[PDB]
Design an enzyme around this catalytic site. Structure first.
Site, short mmCIF file in Angstrom:
data_model
loop_
_atom_site.label_atom_id
_atom_site.label_comp_id
_atom_site.label_asym_id
_atom_site.label_seq_id
_atom_site.Cartn_x
_atom_site.Cartn_y
_atom_site.Cartn_z
N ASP A 82 0.83 -1.21 0.00
CA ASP A 82 0.00 0.00 0.00
C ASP A 82 0.86 1.27 0.00
OD1 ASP A 82 -2.54 -1.31 -0.04
OD2 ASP A 82 -3.18 -0.47 1.87
N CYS A 94 -2.44 0.79 -13.48
CA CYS A 94 -2.51 0.77 -12.03
C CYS A 94 -3.68 1.68 -11.64
CB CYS A 94 -1.16 1.15 -11.42
SG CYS A 94 -0.31 2.66 -12.15
N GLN A 104 6.59 8.01 -10.33
CA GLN A 104 5.94 9.06 -9.53
C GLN A 104 6.75 9.52 -8.33
OE1 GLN A 104 2.07 6.83 -9.10
NE2 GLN A 104 1.21 8.88 -9.22
N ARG A 148 3.47 2.67 -10.87
CA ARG A 148 3.78 1.25 -11.07
C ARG A 148 3.80 0.88 -12.56
NH1 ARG A 148 -0.44 -0.87 -6.39
NH2 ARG A 148 0.24 0.68 -4.84
N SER A 149 2.84 1.40 -13.34
CA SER A 149 2.77 1.10 -14.78
C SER A 149 4.04 1.54 -15.50
CB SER A 149 1.56 1.78 -15.42
OG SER A 149 0.29 1.24 -15.00
#
Ligand code: JOG
Length: 284
Positions: A181, A215, A262, A221-222
């Site tokens: 998370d 994502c 990010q 994440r992508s």
């Protein structure tokens, strides 16, 4: 510089935030006018994450052709990817319309439907064989064929039917279920194992349309997934693998979608994944 020793040099000097801010400063800025039209407000999950006009995927519809999705075309590596947000309640039919129209074999999902106690994307595929889904706005039917649940990821076989023509296709759903998370994984080993399973399926190969990867926003994440895949492919293709510059590859990918990677922690994790992955490929 090479990668593994540039890596230790940034760790010892604690300068990951400065490296990452340089990337943010140099990244491309292209218009995203279609994304910001008022009629598309409920087609965007986040107001600050939009596809560029020049690279956006167009739906084959005359009313409204907009979806929050981008074509990342990597010329030297000879790989393409579609990066998109997690589908919204009012875009699940558009999502599967795109998969159909772009001739994709695979969908790569890097998030859970609920994380941090909030919904990160819609439940857009069926959970039981006998309970199929019909998307009336785009005239598609989607059926769960089989499901294989492993410790770090799940693979599903899905049947997508175009109800207008009665044509059917088999779509593979690759779901990485264990990204934490908060933060990034401690080791890249399970993420790399997952990448290799997607590769082995054919979903990334030129005989199919581009893989769809998402994502929640489709940039963090992508971005890590496609950056690691492309860097490893270039290391196999070139005479000098130490010439692959992960920062330059990331800036090339950011010509096609904003914001890829990010956080500075995601940047460090991408380096780690490519470094460890290059040892397993060979030849080792
Ligand atoms: O639909 C398939 N593949 C495909 C091709 C292009 C785009 C999207 C999916 N399948 C794969 C193979 O061709 C056959 C038929 C179908 C189901 C499984 C079987 O192996």
């Amino acid at each position: 510089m090479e990668m593994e020793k540039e890596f230790e040099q940034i760790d010892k000097s604690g300068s990951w935030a400065a490296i990452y801010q340089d990337i943010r400063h140099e990244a491309s800025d292209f218009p995203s006018r279609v994304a910001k039209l008022p009629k598309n407000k409920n087609r965007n999950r986040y107001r600050d994450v939009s596809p560029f006009d020049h690279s956006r995927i167009k739906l084959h519809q005359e009313d409204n052709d907009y979806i929050n999705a981008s074509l990342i075309k990597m010329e030297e590596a000879q790989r393409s990817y579609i990066l998109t947000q997690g589908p919204l309640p009012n875009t699940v039919g558009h999502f599967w319309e795109m998969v159909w129209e772009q001739k994709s074999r695979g969908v790569v999902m890097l998030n859970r439907v609920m994380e941090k106690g909030s919904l990160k994307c819609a439940q857009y595929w069926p959970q039981k064989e006998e309970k199929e889904m019909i998307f009336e706005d785009t005239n598609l039917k989607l059926t769960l064929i089989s499901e294989d649940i492993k410790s770090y990821y799940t693979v599903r076989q899905l049947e997508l039917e175009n109800l207008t023509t009665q044509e059917t296709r088999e779509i593979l759903h690759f779901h990485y279920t264990t990204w934490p998370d908060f933060g990034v994984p401690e080791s890249p080993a399970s993420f790399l194992n997952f990448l290799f399973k997607v590769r082995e399926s054919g979903s990334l190969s030129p005989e199919h349309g581009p893989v769809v990867v998402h994502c929640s926003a489709g940039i963090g994440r992508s971005g890590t997934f496609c950056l690691a895949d492309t860097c490893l492919l270039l290391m196999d293709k070139r005479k000098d693998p130490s010439s692959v510059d992960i920062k330059k590859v990331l800036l090339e990918m950011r010509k096609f979608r904003m914001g890829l990677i990010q956080t500075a922690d995601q940047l460090r994790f991408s380096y780690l994944a490519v470094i460890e992955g290059a040892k397993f490929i060979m030849g080792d």
